[PDB]
Design a protein around this ligand. Structure first.
Ligand SMILES: OC[C@H]1O[C@H](O[C@H]2[C@H](O)[C@@H](O)[C@@H](O)O[C@@H]2CO)[C@H](O)[C@@H](O)[C@@H]1O
Length: 370
């Protein structure tokens, strides 16, 4: 059973659900329609379950890459924002919400990795990756290191590998070509080679992971790290006078980190599709709406141009958006799973010696296009 005459929305417990409830209240005040916001555990797993029997919430909020599987099963309705409404959000955000050409959700916020540096020991962060080997040598003369970041997860090393030419799946005409994979090209090898060279020359350690790199930076042992907005609070506590800026370039090309877009989708079984569109387009996605949510829990950078211009007064937020625009929207298709597993293995093998760069990426490329 559906509901009709009301809206039930689902959003994770780590987002600003009280603020979203407040926009829901204004909605009821204006139109008279009731809006109920819920935040159940493991909601991203429950949705495909209940939605399959024609039940669940009218609207669901979650990273866009999850909507791919939902769209595949016909769980999400096709949205119809006109050209004028689409012009209100940054163009690249609409690419993260289409499946097989159809628009299946509204972009809300944008997230991506940035370069984080310690202002006290490094007032002027490097503009290029090539500069780092030398910067590390000067800093070591005082018992400090230049950079430390997670080398165990491919999500963190990919920005560098992608810089000069690497890509997961080719995107064109709003579609991904599962046959045009770019982890085996010249650019990718140049990027990984530079990464392996860093470890051989003793600038980084092949075993460094998330906790290890985070501690080094927060203790002031290393001058920089690479992380996302989910890590700022831990830095605030450490008391390090930190900065968040654009990632370094490689061979003159910007680093290209994967982008995650918080999005709002409409249950295909909902009899309240027009109510959902009214609420999402003219209440939530306004300076007033996103403001309400942001106050409760910060959204980071947002897709709405007008509000993003206001939030950008914060240099950390301005950085997140700059790195995201220079990055690669994470693919929402089934094969991306193969990509992750194949690339993880290659990076770890080339870093440990288990395999050379040329061979590691060659095998990865072979497994993914299988
Ligand atoms: O390393 C592969 C891994 O990358 C992504 O995970 C990110 C996530 O997107 C970020 O929001 C944050 O949590 O850091 C994660 C890396 O630990 C993909 O989302 C994930 O599916 C993939 O396995």
């Amino acid at each position: 059973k559906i509901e009709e005459g009301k809206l039930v929305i689902w959003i994770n417990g780590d987002k600003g659900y009280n603020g979203l409830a407040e926009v829901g209240k204004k909605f009821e005040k204006d139109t008279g329609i009731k809006v109920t916001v819920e935040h159940p555990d493991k909601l991203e797993e429950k949705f495909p379950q209940v939605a399959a029997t024609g039940d669940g919430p009218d609207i669901i909020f979650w990273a866009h890459d999850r909507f791919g599987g939902y769209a595949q099963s016909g769980l999400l309705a096709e949205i119809t924002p006109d050209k004028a409404f689409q012009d209100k959000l940054y163009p690249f955000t609409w690419d993260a919400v289409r499946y097989n050409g159809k628009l299946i959700a509204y972009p809300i916020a944008v997230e991506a990795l940035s370069l984080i540096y310690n202002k006290d020991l490094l007032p002027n962060p490097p503009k290029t990756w090539e500069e780092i080997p030398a910067l590390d040598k000067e800093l070591k003369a005082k018992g400090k290191s230049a950079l430390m970041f997670n080398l165990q997860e491919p999500y963190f090393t990919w920005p560098l590998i992608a810089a000069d030419g690497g890509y997961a799946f080719k995107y064109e005409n709003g579609k991904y070509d599962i046959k045009d994979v770019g982890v085996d090209n010249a650019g990718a090898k140049a990027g990984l080679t530079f990464l392996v060279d860093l470890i051989k020359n003793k600038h980084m350690n092949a075993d460094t992971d998330y906790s290890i790199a985070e501690a080094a930076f927060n203790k002031g042992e290393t001058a920089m790290t690479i992380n996302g907005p989910w890590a700022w609070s831990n830095i605030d506590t450490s008391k390090v006078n930190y900065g968040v800026t654009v990632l370094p370039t490689f061979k003159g090309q910007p680093s290209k980190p994967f982008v995650g877009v918080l999005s709002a989708g409409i249950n295909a079984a909902s009899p309240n599709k027009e109510l959902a569109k009214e609420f999402l387009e003219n209440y939530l996605l306004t300076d007033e709406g996103l403001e309400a949510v942001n106050k409760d829990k910060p959204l980071g950078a947002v897709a709405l141009k007008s509000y993003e211009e206001e939030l950008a007064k914060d240099p950390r937020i301005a950085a997140t958006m700059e790195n995201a625009q220079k990055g690669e929207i994470m693919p929402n298709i089934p094969q991306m799973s193969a990509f992750w597993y194949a690339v993880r293995t290659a990076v770890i093998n080339a870093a440990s010696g288990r395999q050379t760069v040329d061979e590691a990426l060659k095998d990865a490329q072979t497994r993914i296009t299988k």
